């Protein structure tokens, strides 16, 4: 598949970087191997595929192997975002496996090393994410230099600078929104635009278009396409994060409420509760972000569906997907791209995991 | 001066990036401003100046303003290394000022925000360092694209990939050396080669040569020059870190012993004590890395000078500086570069701060 072809290009790159760094010893090599295992250990490769479809939309052909490696840099950049997000959220596990800070704290304990095991695991996790990010940029630098016309390089760099600036801004805005207890739908929408719309949809698409041709019309259209679809993707995550079945999502039931995230769905519930039951709005305001029992969580989930926040979320998702498909249909891109991205937009809007 | 010209090029770049990101709101803007204040808030600009002299060594002229901005990327990359090092070391202050995690935890408290103030400060500090590093690479990408011949770009990228790979490896090796209690002089020398020789001397020099011309002879010579001088720089830090006067160094007396660093000087003291007093070696082995009173620290410092570790360190510094000046003198570079770098090598070898 195309995800597998992009994965193989990343697998070969990391193996080369790992061999070239072997002179730094077996401890650093074990760090690089742990990065390999984490990156190549599966995933949908959603962001590289968005770059692939952004390439097909305005290109006459299929891309060279080096351009697939450029797309794979989004996957390595995502490892950086995830590794540092696990430190930010203080998560113990990710997709069933221990987070980096726990793996390296356990390595510390297994060898009866001195000092705090948790300080070591946190330090090593910082450096692991840092490594993923410098190597992700090394891919962009190397592919640009050796495989792209100088015009394609300039367009690729502008997208590369935007995607990393916007994901960093989205992360900081998100932790500020939780700390300041920003209730508004606008605050959550602003974070979703940077963390989901830009970082997951719009900028990946534009990376592919930038690598293919100078199509400023298509770049601006994918901005509007990613704005609707990304917010639809985020709202889907918010519904799953509250009402998802753990056997289907793999996340604990009502994880967003347990973790105190400031989502659009939660923000809309507070607004709808102000309209229909002030005491229900008071329950939400004074419970979000606090240590909740499983009873409190189930109670808050019923209140969220009660005030109609779930129905409003599902209505928004349909509307944003419809307008995203409308934007995609009347677009000066190849019909093959229109069909591929319409498949993705439907899957992202209506999934259960 | 040249440090001021490089600083001004960085000041203008960050102001441009900050204006271009203003649409993300006042909270992220406050983060960018804090990065400005930290980077531009002083410094010797040692690594950019090494890139400057590496440029003069093989160039017929003085560099364009954009090439000075490329040199300033080393200063922004250093902000990343310092911000994440403060999290790794759990330092409360740096050069008199609060570290990032303390500034942002205090911002959290000042606004009566919710959650853990320290978790927020740690999260914000991670993102601050991340920002400095993506923007440092954005400088290298932008200057390469718009100011360098494609041959100069390829040489610059190879140095850029090495310096960030080696500083990351040096950091990980350093925390592994402290956790595993690696006593040997070789372990400390290995860390010093990556953290000091490569990251501070060799790679900065090579960045300047790479931006000027294809002089593989000079690049290999600066590798040998930075190997002697960097280890001399590190040994100077180790002596200051144990025997430095706080009024002169600005660090607390015997900071390296208080912080439990695995330095060459400490490693040599354990080896010399094995030779002259096993019980003194036992005192060092069982005290390094532990919580020490000020009496213990002063006792350990006397033991270090007793076994002659300080004299051995000062002898090594003179020898490495002599061979570094010998390497510099018989080098196919401009005589102006030879005089400038000889000034730096003397200052780095014999300083008190
Ligand atoms: C891409 C970024 C910035 C983080 C990825 O993790 P998520 O965004 O899915 O995780 P939470 O913030 O929901 O915990
Ligand atoms: C460049 C790097 C990796 C860190 C800079 O700080 P120092 O190296 O001077 O700090 P310590 O490790 O001695 O605490
Ligand atoms: Ca998070
Ligand atoms: Ca998370
Ligand atoms: Ca999320
Ligand atoms: Ca340190
Ligand atoms: Ca330090
Ligand atoms: Ca040091
Ligand atoms: Cl909406
Ligand atoms: Cl030596």
Residue numbers in the entry:
A (entry chain A), B (entry chain A): 0 to 352
According to the publication:
We report structures of the Mycobacterium tuberculosis isoprenyl diphosphate synthase Rv2173 in three forms: apo and two substrate-bound forms [isoprenyl diphosphate (IPP) and dimethylallyl diphosphate (DMAPP)]. The protein possesses a canonical all-α-helical trans-isoprenyl diphosphate synthase fold that is dimeric in each form. Two divalent-metal-binding aspartic acid-rich DDxxD motifs termed the FARM and SARM (first and second aspartic acid-rich DDxxD motifs) are important in all-E-prenyltransferase mechanisms.
It has three metal ions bound: two to the FARM unit (DDLID; residues 84–88) and one near the SARM unit (DDVLGVFGD; residues 236–244), with the IPP occupying the putative allylic/DMAPP site, coordinating all three metal ions and making interactions with Lys194 and Lys260. While surprising, there is precedent for IPP binding to the allylic/DMAPP site in other E-prenyltransferases. Variations in the FARM and SARM motifs have been proposed to influence how the metals coordinate; however, it is important to note that IPP is not the physiological ligand for the metal-associated allylic binding site. We observe a role for Phe232 from this site in changes associated with C-terminal closure in the IPP-bound structure. In this structure, Arg350 faces into the active site and forms hydrogen-bonding interactions with the final C-terminal residue Ala352, as well as Asp236 from the SARM motif and the backbone of Phe232. The apo structure was solved with a dimer in the asymmetric unit in space group P21212, while both substrate-bound structures were solved in space group I222 with monomers in the asymmetric unit, generating dimers on the application of crystallographic symmetry.
